[PDB]
Point group: D2
Chain length 251, copies 4
């Protein structure tokens, strides 16, 4: 990544890199997804491809592809590991409410905490150290909010205050809007490099046709592969990720 | 009731560790020793030292100690995350043994195309009245350590919040001697009695003096998204390779 | 006796995350008209930028603006982002006409060459602790005219530049890019529109400026800078002096240095 | 033209991690003699601490100390820990005899009540690090002009790591009715520093520090020079912000003098 790209990833929490994969490559990726099973993730009008690398050698190798790994290296700067690799296929009336955010809250029963160390990032001696980054590979054009554009709360990756708990305001900000909520439009083939510290989601998709992407999650070698945990287990051997406040919790 | 007091949290924050005296009684200690003598050990690579690799696996006693509330309660107060047990091991040491310095907030690591100076496994922070340290140990001592010749725990003052690397420079000059042996202006010792726990932010640069006259068990905790402790040489070409890759330690140079 | 938070949780969130906050309609049209009429009575200086007039020290020149500088409607939000014993560091006015512009300045990690090069300016280095922001240098901009399009010379800022860890301007100069980003554009350069009577509360760590003004009519604002009591009142300083008694502010890279 | 770093890698490491640095033998015995002689010919004031005399403004009072304040043996290490365009903020002297003491002051996270709120950062001493450089806005060079080799000489003391403390220390002690200074009672992380005449102690004012009670005969003597950025005002004590917000000075957070 160039100095300007590093500046932009640092200051905004993400980076769009245009035309990483060519038209030939893109259609090849579309083909494989058509020939692959999906699940209901409990999100309306949304089909998920749960584990792309363990479902297809096309995506098992994309996960290790150099166009992805190299910019990821430049923002993680740790010995690297694959944490996850999934696909999303969306139709009209689907939506992805806000999640992420550097200072959102979590009640741990006896106490309330406001840092999630899995996304807590820093900077030292000319290098970014972000522990959890996604490479989003868009396989369809998203050029207006009604295409279900990616959206993000500006600067939320470095926020010191929690946003969502005070609102719980049962309407999502991706629908109602927010003064610092901005949209990002992408072309098929583009890659969005994302600091998972960013509070982000997508607008509601109102257009017809399929919205398609493949998401790959990376972190240091001492991170576990991604897995949802309701809470820490009684015998302290339960592994996984316990999310702080997200809009799904009250919208 | 908070596990750690105001003063205790202040001390852990400012020094990187906390000795809590008399956590486990005579009988408990004797029990722990008795169980240790039962169990197999491996050659950990350090002379006059035997390592009990996976105590919770090899013994129900230490499977139970690892979850003891007297360890978990203070550990919670400095991790403040959903918790996982990352490791649990024992160390038995005789005269002539030594543990060189390791840890350090800003020690270096060569990755292959770049040099990095943060280890996120030990990178800690503070937010709204709470410490957030990702990798902490509860060291449970099973023998008295009251002098440097007992092989006392020692640490580099403030090294858990260091912004500069210390060890690479020493090696570049060719200082083959360990600071635990030679001394260092800010290297200090800690003395404990058996049954005490030393609660340790792993970001701290620490080791032990050489023993001349030694029983402890160590339990490592972190967030639920950390993998259980395993030594890793480098990232695999597979990126499925899991483990912890340490930055500079004295063992690499001494 | 009946204190109410000057800033809401959401307002603090926005100021923290973006480095500024627009507070709408702080001053009603009557007060705005009063401020305008008072500026009409005052003289200006040439600040070295074309089509710009500066009212150099408004609290010294006017009881109206001396009062404004201390108005609780400005001080109360300022206290919520500085959170130190307070000092007024400057108070000035700007009147701009067509073809005037204000190049980018500020930024958290811009460079300064001293036998060494440094990348922090401690006058704008800010932090957060136990539920409170601590920003050492903040401005309250009171707009006395409507700025509703870029062509009105809108305030613009580089997104997240108040917490930037990398320098932006030194490299653009090295690459010979000698036109301002406010004219050329930049991917994360964004505009802010305001109405007369609005206040823009600004962390001076933010890299900001304005677009070039193309429209008719006077663009008018008054700006008040605040910091801790141990900060000196604002004065430009070229370099530390030989005797180490020189006081003032030595800015890091700004676009004016090479555009 | 032939610049070598004022501070070594190790010296920077130590200053960063401990909040201070003792630089031995910076000034020779003859120079120390020159400084002592000059102080004897200058007037003091009563600073309001028992058995303590203060020379309030040495660089104004005498060209010798004006020159000392600008000596590169002080300025070069100061520059390496401030890393800003520099200004001299104060220069004073302290002469102490037996039964004198200096209670703890400083500390990164001590509290200050401001009427409608309590704050826990003092931006005059809030310091950071970036790209290989320390940025500490308020540092002192203490030039010792006598030997201090035991606690009863009134040794400098400090709370370990207090320059980077995230919690306050003094307020809770006061609330728990502990009105005995830690320099008298001790504290688990309170440490002492011994110095020789001619040594310089370079000090991050974020560090919580003071001295032990002096019991010994012979004057305890030093001169202190305070430096920070050009936009800092010269040091002046200030109780509160002023009515017109034009008042300049430094409003300290909790110090032991408030409680003990
Ligand atoms: C009832 N299950 C929900 C329980 C919530 N506590 C989770 O935060 C939520 O999960 C989140 O959902 C939001 C939408 O509301 C996004 O889908 C987030 O994106 C996810 O899940 C995130 O983020 C994860 C991690 N970034 C955070 O653990 C992984 O990357 C996953 O692949 C990814 O779908 C689950 O859906
Ligand atoms: C040849 N193998 C060595 C490879 C080095 N790169 C390691 O850093 C070193 O490992 C370290 O050894 C030092 C002694 O020189 C301490 O023993 C450290 O303490 C250890 O290993 C640490 O720290 C680990 C983690 N804290 C860091 O990975 C785990 O807790 C281990 O169980 C624990 O013994 C290994 O021995
Ligand atoms: C030769 N004169 C220029 C010398 C540069 N080194 C200054 O940075 C520049 O000063 C800056 O100019 C830009 C425009 O190019 C803005 O005007 C900045 O805004 C200023 O000057 C700032 O910022 C100052 C402080 N924020 C920074 O010291 C004060 O607020 C001033 O009132 C305010 O005009 C001067 O004009
Ligand atoms: C009733 N007057 C006291 C009021 C307190 N609020 C001050 O904190 C205290 O001032 C402090 O006193 C302690 C002793 O209790 C040390 O002397 C500190 O050191 C001082 O005063 C500091 O620190 C100042 C700055 N470091 C902080 O403002 C300057 O360096 C001074 O020259 C220096 O004496 C005054 O004495
Ligand atoms: O669909 C997008 O553009 C973003 C997807 C996302 O944020 C996620 O899957 O976590
Ligand atoms: O032996 C001790 O006292 C501490 C042991 C230790 O530091 C370790 O094994 O990591
Ligand atoms: O004119 C504006 O809108 C902002 C002016 C500004 O940034 C300044 O005066 O420094
Ligand atoms: O007397 C000393 O050794 C230190 C004095 C000091 O800390 C001060 O003057 O603020
Ligand atoms: Ni997401
Ligand atoms: Ni260890
Ligand atoms: Ni400006
Ligand atoms: Ni002092």
């Amino acid at each position: 990544l160039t100095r300007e790209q590093l500046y932009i990833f640092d200051t905004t929490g993400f980076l769009v890199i245009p035309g990483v994969f060519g038209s030939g490559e893109v259609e090849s990726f579309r083909s494989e997804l058509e020939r692959l099973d999906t699940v209901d993730p409990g999100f309306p009008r949304t089909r998920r491809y749960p584990d792309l690398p363990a479902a297809s050698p096309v995506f098992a190798r994309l996960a290790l592809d150099d166009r992805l790994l190299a910019p990821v290296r430049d923002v993680v700067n740790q010995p690297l590991r694959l944490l996850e690799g999934y696909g999303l296929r969306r139709t009209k009336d689907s939506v992805l409410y806000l999640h992420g955010g550097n200072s959102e809250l979590l009640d741990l029963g006896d106490r309330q905490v406001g840092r999630d160390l899995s996304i807590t990032h820093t900077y030292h001696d000319g290098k970014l150290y972000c522990p959890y980054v996604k490479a989003l590979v868009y396989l369809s054009d998203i050029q207006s909010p009604e295409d279900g554009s990616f959206c993000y709360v500006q600067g939320s990756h470095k926020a010191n205050f929690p946003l969502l708990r005070e609102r719980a305001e049962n309407t999502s900000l991706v629908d109602s809007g927010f003064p610092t909520l901005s949209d990002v439009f992408v072309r098929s083939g583009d890659v969005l490099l994302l600091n998972e510290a960013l509070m982000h989601g997508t607008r509601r998709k109102l257009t017809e046709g399929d919205r398609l992407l493949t998401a790959f999650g990376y972190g240091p070698t001492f991170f576990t592969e991604w897995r949802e945990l309701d809470a820490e287990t009684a015998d302290l051997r339960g592994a996984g990720y316990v999310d702080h406040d997200v809009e799904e919790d009250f919208v």
